[PDB]
Design a protein around this ligand. Structure first.
Ligand code: MG
Ligand code: MG
Ligand code: MG
Ligand code: MG
Ligand code: MG
Ligand code: MG
Ligand code: MG
Ligand code: MG
Ligand code: MG
Ligand code: MG
Ligand code: MG
Ligand code: MG
Ligand code: MG
Ligand code: MG
Ligand code: MG
Ligand code: MG
Ligand code: MG
Ligand code: MG
Ligand code: MG
Ligand code: MG
Ligand code: MG
Ligand code: MG
Ligand code: MG
Ligand code: MG
Ligand code: MG
Ligand code: MG
Ligand code: MG
Ligand code: MG
Ligand code: MG
Ligand code: MG
Ligand code: MG
Ligand code: MG
Lengths: 80, 205, 82, 156, 122, 129
RNA sequence: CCCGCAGAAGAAGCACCGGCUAACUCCGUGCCAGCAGCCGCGGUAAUACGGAGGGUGCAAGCGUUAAUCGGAAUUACUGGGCGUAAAGCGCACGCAGGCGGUUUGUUAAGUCAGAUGUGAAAUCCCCGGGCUCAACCUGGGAACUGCAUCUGAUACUGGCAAG
RNA sequence: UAGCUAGUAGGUGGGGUAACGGCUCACCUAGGCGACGAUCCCUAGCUGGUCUGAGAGGAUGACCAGCCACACUGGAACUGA
């Protein structure tokens, strides 16, 4: 078991790379309402396997570029 | 740090006898105890809620001879301590060393007792204690040292105390001039004229 | 290096030393790795005054920690008393 | 044993052809110290008469209050038009922590340990009315047991 | 009011301006009397109230009341000003301190001497 | 739109008690039935009866004692605009323990006291006094 | 720190007293001089100005000024409101967003439970201990409402599938 | 203050670092950030804590301790773990 996060692929244009929103459903500090917050992450994906809209599991790793410190581990729900 | 003014003046203002005199001579003979001090004594204005609370607090402070900052500290300590706050405050005040000396009878007044304590006449557990605010604890022996044991004031004070009502919470030996502070007094043990509740409200405005 | 030394605490003329493990570079009362005892030089009779967690000290020494001269003296005293 | 105390005395005026007519209103509150409290609002041309009228009114139309060991039965809110009032039971020795009018009403009622606050308007008559209403509505565990058709032990 | 609305745009604390901004959160400040004059009070009062328009060390040109009966002030007279308005001079927000630099203590005062910079008589 | 059926049910109960209605009917749901069951157990209503197959109707029989309503107050707490969840140490005591608080836990809808006894928190549906 | 020496000897002021707010009189002035935190006071009987006597409150300090929170439910999450007091867009349509009737299955994201790790020391609080007492120092606890990971529960909310 | 960015975003390969890395360079791709506030402007050392408050909050960051930055102003490296 390794630490990993799931997220929808917000973009897949930059080659070998995808952007993966990691929406978390946090509670508001004061008002107590539960707000959908988002976390964009530049994820490395070799072979350009991922599509846009694709759900994808990712893990943290040594930084591969200026913005890219995550790698994909497995794709799920990769329908179009 | 001490009130150095007229004492029957304070008593008259309060209404009660605060025991600021030895009690050889009656307060009615020493002053117009009924009438309040000053030009406008022969008048009793209707007292506000704040006023009554303040008067009670003043009475207690005068009785023991504690200035306000010290009194406030006492109140805070009492509040912090578990149980009833007014009761705790009364207990602390009683616990004071000058007060215990007075109760035992090594002084006609608390002013006299305080003087003795300051001047190093009083030993607590065979150790000369000098502070009047010193909290005496249960099972504490408190004694006149020999140099003050020859004092005619001390022996006179003892006689007066014998006349007075003896406290249940102390045990005192007149020949030895030593008393054991067995326990801190309970509210039923202290005087009923004191309305500690007013004081609690005042310091919890 | 890591050392075991006294840190001065208390009031003026009434020192109370906390025995602490700390990187020697750090200031006397500053950053420290572990607090492994205390020492009270004005402590009266019928008071403990000294207390060194000897096991921890042994562990740190094993790791390679130097010991202040005063702390060493304290250790000796503790051993004799016990 | 019917302890009574006057909260507020207020001078009010009427205007007539001649000039102004002054009169006094007295808001008093009586209570037996075991649960019963009642307030009264008297009006007369002079203060003592007004107070007497108020006292008579208060002495009549009292209301019973479920007190648990000299304290409230549960935290209760109360409103009366501007005066919205909150009052909460507190540990023995807390004393009455309550405003003016509120303190009076509670004390005569017989509550020895309460934490109160008056929100909204603090107009004595309305605030007293609010407090009495709140105290009246406050039910006890025997009452809740009766309502729900259980024993008091099942509810606790 | 709606929780969503609050989340969107939370509640603004009511930023209270100071009523003595020339002090600039200082308890007092020094200045030089640009001009010393008397002025008329507001509609429930009649007087000739003594006041001095003063340039402060920090640039501000304020107006300052001069309390006490009589004063030894004139142009180019270095004074200390403190907080406090004359409710009845409109726009006067500061008092001079009697018993400071150029300002003298009040003459022949026996009461509130501390308020008017007067030393204790024998 | 109807956006809160539990709230609607609570409101119906309140209005029925106000208006001295003997019974109150509403579209049945499983959550509603569970809440109703809890209410019956605690004794704030006399009975409930689900009736129908295609679109079933819950019929609650309301409870009166001395001419006045048994359910003195009944407020929704968690609601779609603002969900409320509490932990076992944070579970509320309604009317200082006299009234009950309906809590949806992992082990089904139960009163606050029951939930506390079990040792788990959940969605605080409503207070009832 | 202790012992001795002499002698009440060397040691009390500051503010206030119309209401809020504990404490009142006389004289002087006469909308002047002045006061004032608010409301107000003073135009010839001023408990409000100034002096005196008397009193009240603090006391080696006492007032004033500045500053923050409180009271202030006066930005209202707890905890406000919008017919006439300030406040419903002139009316609609509609994207983002917020919310979502009813049943079953599934997931376990929110939620809940347990554990583990961490949450420096000081500080705060509790029971003790040491300075003659206190302040102050100090032993041990409690707390640090948090965050992370793992293992569960699945009623509710979310996702997915069929109705 | 609604658009900002060309080493800019990503890739391949060299170089460089004690170390990963547009850190740097050549080429390729045309990306990347942004109404969950980018960019721009004003203010500010951060925290344990401190004051206040029943709490939730509000204000604050002297002293003591942890972290950071600076050393007349602006750049630069050398020595060295
Ligand atoms: Mg002092
Ligand atoms: Mg403004
Ligand atoms: Mg006037
Ligand atoms: Mg008065
Ligand atoms: Mg004055
Ligand atoms: Mg005259
Ligand atoms: Mg006169
Ligand atoms: Mg006045
Ligand atoms: Mg006067
Ligand atoms: Mg507020
Ligand atoms: Mg309003
Ligand atoms: Mg309008
Ligand atoms: Mg309209
Ligand atoms: Mg639904
Ligand atoms: Mg949706
Ligand atoms: Mg989960
Ligand atoms: Mg700590
Ligand atoms: Mg001790
Ligand atoms: Mg589900
Ligand atoms: Mg579902
Ligand atoms: Mg490279
Ligand atoms: Mg290379
Ligand atoms: Mg700066
Ligand atoms: Mg800085
Ligand atoms: Mg508050
Ligand atoms: Mg500094
Ligand atoms: Mg540097
Ligand atoms: Mg330098
Ligand atoms: Mg310089
Ligand atoms: Mg340089
Ligand atoms: Mg070297
Ligand atoms: Mg080198």
């Amino acid at each position: 078991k390794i630490r990993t996060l799931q997220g929808r692929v917000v973009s897949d244009k930059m080659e070998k790379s995808i952007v993966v929103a990691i929406e978390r459903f946090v509670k508001h500090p004061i008002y107590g309402k539960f707000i959908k917050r988002t976390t964009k992450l530049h994820v490395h994906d070799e072979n350009n396997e991922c599509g846009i809209g694709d759900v994808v599991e990712i893990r943290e790793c040594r930084p591969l570029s200026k913005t890219k410190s995550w790698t994909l581990v497995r794709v799920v729900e990769k329908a179009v | 740090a001490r009130y150095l003014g007229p004492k029957l003046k304070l008593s008259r203002r309060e209404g009660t006898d605060l025991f600021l005199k030895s009690g050889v001579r009656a307060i009615d003979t020493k002053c117009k105890i009924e009438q309040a001090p000053g030009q406008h004594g022969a008048r009793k204005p209707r007292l506000s809620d704040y006023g009554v609370q303040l008067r009670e607090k003043q009475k207690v402070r005068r009785i023991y001879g504690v200035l306000e900052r010290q009194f406030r500290n006492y109140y805070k300590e009492a509040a912090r301590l578990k149980g009833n706050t007014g009761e705790n405050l009364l207990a602390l005040l009683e616990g004071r060393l000058d007060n215990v000396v007075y109760r035992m009878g090594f002084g006609a007044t608390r002013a006299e007792a305080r003087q003795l304590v300051s001047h190093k006449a009083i030993m607590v557990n065979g150790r000369v204690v000098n502070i009047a605010s010193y909290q005496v604890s249960p099972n504490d022996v408190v004694s006149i040292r020999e140099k003050a044991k020859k004092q005619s004031r001390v022996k006179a004070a003892l006689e007066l105390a014998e006349q007075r009502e003896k406290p249940t919470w102390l045990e005192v030996d007149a020949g030895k001039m030593e008393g054991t502070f067995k326990r801190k007094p309970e509210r039923s043990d202290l005087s009923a004229d004191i309305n500690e509740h007013l004081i609690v409200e005042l310091y919890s405005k | 290096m890591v050392t075991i030394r006294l840190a001065r605490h208390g009031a003026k003329k009434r020192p109370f030393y906390q025995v602490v493990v700390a990187d020697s570079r750090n200031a006397r009362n500053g950053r420290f790795i572990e607090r492994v005892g205390f020492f009270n030089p004005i402590a009266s009779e019928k008071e403990e005054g000294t207390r060194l967690d000897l096991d921890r000290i042994a562990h740190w020494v094993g790791q390679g920690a130097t010991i202040s001269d005063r702390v060493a003296a304290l250790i000796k005293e503790v051993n004799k008393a016990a | 044993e019917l302890q009574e105390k006057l909260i507020a005395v207020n001078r009010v005026s009427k205007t007539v052809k001649g000039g102004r007519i002054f009169s006094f209103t007295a808001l008093t509150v009586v209570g037996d110290g075991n649960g019963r409290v009642g307030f009264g609002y008297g009006k007369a041309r002079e203060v003592p008469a007004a107070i007497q009228k108020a006292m008579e009114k208060a002495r009549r139309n009292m209301i019973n209050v479920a007190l648990n060991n000299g304290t409230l039965q549960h935290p209760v809110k109360g409103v009366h038009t501007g005066s919205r009032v909150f009052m909460q039971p507190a540990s023995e020795g807390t004393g009455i922590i309550a405003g003016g009018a509120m303190r009076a009403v509670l004390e005569v009622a017989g509550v020895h340990n309460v934490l109160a606050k008056a929100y909204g308007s603090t107009n004595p008559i309305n605030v007293v009315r609010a407090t009495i209403d709140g105290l009246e509505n406050m039910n006890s565990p025997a009452m809740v047991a009766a309502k729900r058709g259980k024993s008091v032990e099942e509810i606790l | 009011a709606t929780v969503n609305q609050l989340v969107r745009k939370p509640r603004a604390r009511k930023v209270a301006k100071s009523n003595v901004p020339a002090l600039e959160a200082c308890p007092q400040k020094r200045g030089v009397c640009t001009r010393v004059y008397t002025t008329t009070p507001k509609k429930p009062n009649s007087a000739l109230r003594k006041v001095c328009r003063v340039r402060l060390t920090n640039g501000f040109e304020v107006t300052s009341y001069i309390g006490g009966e009589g004063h030894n002030l004139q142009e180019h007279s270095v004074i200390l000003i403190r907080g406090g308005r004359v409710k009845d001079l409109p726009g006067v927000r500061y008092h001079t301190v009697r018993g400071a630099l150029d300002c003298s203590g009040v003459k022949d005062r026996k009461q509130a001497r501390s308020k008017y910079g007067v030393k204790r008589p024998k | 739109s109807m956006q809160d059926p539990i709230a609607d049910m609570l409101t119906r109960i309140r209005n029925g008690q106000a208006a001295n209605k003997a019974a109150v009917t509403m579209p049945s749901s499983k959550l509603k039935v569970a809440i109703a069951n809890v209410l019956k157990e605690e004794g704030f209503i006399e009975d409930f009866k689900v009736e129908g197959d295609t679109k079933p109707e819950l019929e609650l029989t309301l409870k009166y004692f001395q001419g006045k309503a048994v359910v003195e107050s009944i407020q929704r707490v968690s609601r779609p605009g603002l969900r409320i969840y509490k932990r076992k140490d944070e579970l509320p005591k309604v009317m200082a323990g006299l009234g009950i608080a309906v809590v949806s836990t992992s082990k089904g809808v139960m009163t606050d006291r029951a939930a506390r006894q079990a040792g788990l928190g959940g969605e605080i549906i409503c207070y009832v006094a």
